[PDB]
Design a protein around this ligand. Sequence first.
Ligand SMILES: [Zn+2]
Ligand SMILES: [Zn+2]
Lengths: 102, 147, 116, 148, 49, 72, 46
Amino acid sequence: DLDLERSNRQVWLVRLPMFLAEKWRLGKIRINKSKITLLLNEPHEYDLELTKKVVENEYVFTEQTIPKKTAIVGTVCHECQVMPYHKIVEQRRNIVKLNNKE
Amino acid sequence: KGSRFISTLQVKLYGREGSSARTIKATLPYIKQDIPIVIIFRALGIIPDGEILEHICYDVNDWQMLEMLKPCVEDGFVIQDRETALDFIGRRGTALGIKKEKRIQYAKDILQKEFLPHITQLEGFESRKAFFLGYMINRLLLCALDR
Amino acid sequence: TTFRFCRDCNNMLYPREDKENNRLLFECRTCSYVEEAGSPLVYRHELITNIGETAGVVQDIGSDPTLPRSDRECPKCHSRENVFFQSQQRRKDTSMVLFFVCLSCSHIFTSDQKNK
Amino acid sequence: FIKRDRMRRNFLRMREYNEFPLRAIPKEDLENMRTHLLKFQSKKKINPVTDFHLPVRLHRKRKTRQLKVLDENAKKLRFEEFYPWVMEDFYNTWVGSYEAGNSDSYVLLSVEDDGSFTMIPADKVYKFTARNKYATXXXXXXXXXXXX
Amino acid sequence: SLMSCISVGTDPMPIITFLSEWGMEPLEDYVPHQSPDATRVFVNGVWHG
Amino acid sequence: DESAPITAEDSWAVISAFFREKGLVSQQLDSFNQFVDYTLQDIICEDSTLILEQLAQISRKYEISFGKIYVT
Amino acid sequence: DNDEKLIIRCRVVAEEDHMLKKIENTMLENITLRGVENIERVVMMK
Ligand SMILES: [Zn+2]
Ligand SMILES: [Zn+2]
C-alpha cells in the first residue's frame, strides 16, 4: 500500500565535513541574497556553496517478493556543500596524519 | 597485502590495420572465451551506448575513436539488456553452476569480487570499475591511433 | 562521422534511405524515432592522418619547466616569450616542424616557412 | 690537486539577509523511518512522480565434524538484502540499485512552511533506472542469433 | 650506486583521506561533459577521482 | 656570509652526513627491521581465525585465533 | 588532371552503405595500379 504523501516538499542535500557530521550523528542559516552562511551554537559560521542549481530526477523517500510500507517525502531542491579559527582545523587536519601501530 | 593475487585482466583489439570490423574483446578470469567490452558494460549496469562512448572517449570533438567504437556498439546492439548480459557471461564461462538462477548471481559475484581485485571487492562499486574499464579502453584505442 | 544519438534510447542513429520522398534519414532500430537528414555525408575514412600532431595542449602549458624557451615573437601579440614543441602525432613519417605556443594570448603559430 | 685531510685543524682553528534557524528532529521519527535517496538514469530532465501517474508502487522483488569459513556483520546484513525494489503503476518501470560509496556525509535540509529547516542524516542512497522502455528480449533466441 | 636505496612502503589511507578534504570529487560522481578539464588523481594505480 | 652559495667541494660534507646516518648496507637492515616490526603482526592478524563446526543430534562450534605475536 | 582537386565517384546497379564499404576495402587493398608483386623501393645506383 505505497502512497505518495506530498513530494511537494523541497529538500536540500548537504556534504558536511567529518567532525561536524559525526557531531550531528543547532545553528541558524543566514541566506544572503547568492551567498549563504551558517551560525552554529557556541560556533563557526559556514558559507554553503550552491553546488548544483538544477537538480531534477532526484527525490527523497522513506520506508516504514516482500512488499513493505513505502512513503514518499519530497523533491530535491538544490545540491549544496558546506565550506569552512581555521588554523586549528588545519592543524587538526595535519594532526590526523600521525596514526601509528604498536 | 594478503593472498598474493595473480589474476591479470587483458583487453584485446582484434583486426589488423587496414581491414574493417576491428572489434574489441576483453578476457575475464574463470570465463573461457573472450567477451566484448560493451557486453561487460551491460553487465556492470550501464545499458545505453551513449554513456558507454561517454566513459570510453572523454572528448566529443574527436570522431576517430568513436568511429572505431562502432562495431562494438553493433555487437552491443545484439545484446541490449543487463540481465541478458549477466546470463550471457553466466552461460559463457564457468559451467559448474548448472542452475541458471545461481549462475547469474554467481556471475554478478564474479563481477563484484574476482573482476578487478584492486580498488575493492565489495558490492556496489560497478560504476567506478566501469569508469576504470573505459579508461583502459581509452588507452588501448588511444594507442591504436598512433598517438 | 559525427553521428547523433536517439532520444530516450540514446542509441546510435543508423542511416535510413527514404524511398517515398527520396531523402536521407536517421533511425534508431530499437524504437520508432527517425529524424531528418541535414547533410548527405555519412562516412569519411580519411587515410593520411595529419591531426594529433598538436595534441595535449592545456591552459597550464606555460608552467611546464621541462619544456624549452625561445625568443621568437608572436605574429599576433608580438610576444618574444613563448614555448615551442614538435608534433605530438608519433609516427615514422612525422615531420620535425616546430610548434610555437605564445605565453600571452595562448596562440599556436608554427615555424613552417613552406606551408602555413 | 691533493686530498685535503687536515680539515680537523682548520675547523678547530676556525670554530538583504534572512536568518533562519536549524533544528534536529527528535530521534523517534528517525527510529520509525529510514531516509534513502533517489536518482534516476533516463537522461530526461523532468520525470516527476506526479507524471509517473498512479498507483505508484515501490516494492522489493551425512557429514561428520567439518570446517566453516567466517564473515562479519554489516556486510552480511547488506548481503542478505539482495532483492532490489521497483516502482510501477498497474506502464512505467523503475528498478533501483545501491550506491554505497555515496554514503559518507549526506545531510538533508528539508524545507517546511516556515523559513526554518529540518536536518535529517541520510541512511543510504539508490540509483533508479527506467526499465523496459522498448519492451523486447529473447535469451536463447539471441544466443542462436549471435552465432551467425 | 653509492647513494641508491630501496623504498619500504607506507600507508596510502591518510593521503586519500587528505585529498577529499580540499574538494577532490569522487569517481562515481564524474561527468566528462560537466568537467572535461578535470585532472585525474591516481593513488597506486587506483583511480579514486 | 651564512646565506652564501655553496661550492662543489662543500657537497662532499653532505655525502658524509649521508653515510653517517644510513651506512653502506642500510636497505637490508631497514627492510628486515620493518618486516620484523609490521609484517609479522600483519601476517598473523590477516588470517588467524579458524573455527571447527561440530554437529550433534544440538549444534556446536569451536574457535582458535592468534593475537599479538612475540619475538625474542 | 587539370582539376586542382582529384575526384573519383562510383555507384552500383538492405542499406547500400555496407555494400559500398566492402567495395572500399576491395579498392584500397586489392587493386594494384602497376608493377609486379613483392617489389618496393627501387633504388638507382651508379
Ligand atoms: Zn531509440
Ligand atoms: Zn601570442
